[PDB]
Design a protein around this ligand. Structure first.
Ligand SMILES: O=C(O)c1cc(=O)[nH]c(=O)n1[C@@H]1O[C@H](COP(=O)(O)O)[C@@H](O)[C@H]1O
Ligand SMILES: O=C(O)c1cc(=O)[nH]c(=O)n1[C@@H]1O[C@H](COP(=O)(O)O)[C@@H](O)[C@H]1O
Lengths: 256, 256
């Protein structure tokens, strides 16, 4: 097993994955903040304060009540300053012809500001082909959703294997997975795991939680994605530091 | 087998399904226009001219370069005038806690103007439970994506059966399916089929076409969803009438 810094140099590494792995190693963080807020001011204040603690800030642009492209310009300034990627968790899941337009155009112009997006594999590989026709020219990366944290997820067995094959066949654009575990044996691919809290539990709408030690240490994932475990805490900076230290030590203990 | 008008009266019918089935029968249309345009003015001019020919207008709000809520107000005026439902093809596909926010909030406020939305079943039933928390109080309906038109679709076999079970267990909110065929034997549920053109073919990003006679007549679906077969034609009104007459006669001939 290689360090994040060594994985950043692998021959087949995607440039977006390399940039991410280098700043993970530099900053000792494998934490992705899930910035699940409705106010631009709260999004930007979290990005500024937690920027030094995170490798990535994950957005849902479509729940921002006061979205503008100028908000995303301000988020990019903070991403550059503090060194983290922006990941829009849009979960593209339509035919290729439609997702290309949803990625490039409309009000959000996601491809203009998002380093990473993700896609469901259920429509077949046309979803990746459509996205990559916008994303490749804009030097972007994509994550495929191989496993899901929610109760009743159908992303198991042959479905997960299909996601891994689709990723490994589109490595010019696909840089990794949303998964609960290591699903690819190829170290060029990133594994990002949501459904993470320090305490056991879930929510009222099918979310299930596992700890950073479980998902990074035992299940072999790379990055934890944490929303409410940080966002709902009073001191979001201290909460981010507790999640960062948990995920980082779990990673170190698997390296030996 | 019952007529659309008789299905509108079934004991377990959802009010949104009933409204749709009644206007389908009244207007002799089982055509859904897929209004896949980037300009509000073109969306509204198509809605006005084709309104009499359609039972439903399907949107992708996130590809409208000049979206505002006022555009949606004008679309509702046309939907009420010409009698068609508005279906936002958002393909919700996240955990329940996230999709509730994506449906009610952000800049689109989809639930405020969309009679129907749809969801992927891959996250498990929490996706439906999250949507229904917003949609039930707003008297809305939902379609579950049981089958997809695109090459390499994983929505087959056990996946399709899981979509039907999830629909039949959430009948207070789920009114039918996106499918290529009749997938439920319960006549209360609507079947809407995209991937429809009069001529054989596909696109360059995995779309596959079947004819109205094939999907309504042979495969037993209720409604055809047609985008480019109409939108790319010079005369979109005549194209809509061709598709309407094809789908309507296929329905009548299955009825006998
Ligand atoms: O793609 C995602 O990040 C995602 C995938 C998944 O399997 N489960 C999952 O919870 N998510 C997202 O990750 C975040 C989880 O947030 P919390 O449950 O608050 O920590 C939400 O924004 C979800 O939309
Ligand atoms: O839910 C949908 O309508 C959908 C499901 C599916 O299986 N395939 C599919 O093409 N669609 C949508 O239906 C429309 C098909 O458009 P055309 O290929 O131009 O007729 C697109 O807007 C798609 O996003």
């Amino acid at each position: 097993e290689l360090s994040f810094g060594a994985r950043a140099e692998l021959p087949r590494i995607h440039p977006v994955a390399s940039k991410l792995l280098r700043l993970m190693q530099k900053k000792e963080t494998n934490l992705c903040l899930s910035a699940d807020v409705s106010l631009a001011r709260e999004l930007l204040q979290l990005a500024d304060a937690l920027g030094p603690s995170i490798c990535m800030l994950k957005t849902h642009v479509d729940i921002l009540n006061d979205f503008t492209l100028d908000v995303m310009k301000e988020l990019i300034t903070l991403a550059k300053c503090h060194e983290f990627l922006i990941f829009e968790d849009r979960k593209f899941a339509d035919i290729g012809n439609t997702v290309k337009k949803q990625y490039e155009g409309g009000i959000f112009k996601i491809a203009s500001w998002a380093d990473l997006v993700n896609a469901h594999v259920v429509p077949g590989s046309g979803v990746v082909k459509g996205l990559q026709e916008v994303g490749l020219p804009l030097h972007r990366g994509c994550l495929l959703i191989a496993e899901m944290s929610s109760t009743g997820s159908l992303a198991t067995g042959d479905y997960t294997r299909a996601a891994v094959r689709m990723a490994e066949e589109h490595s010019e654009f696909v840089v990794g997975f949303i998964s609960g575990s290591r699903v690819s044996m190829k170290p060029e691919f990133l594994h990002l795991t949501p459904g993470v809290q320090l305490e056991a539990g879930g929510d009222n709408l099918g979310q299930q939680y596992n700890s950073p030690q479980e998902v990074i240490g035992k299940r072999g994932s790379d990055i934890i994605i944490v929303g409410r475990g940080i966002i709902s805490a009073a001191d979001r900076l201290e909460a981010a530091e507790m999640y960062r230290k948990a995920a980082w030590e779990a990673y170190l203990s698997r390296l030996g």
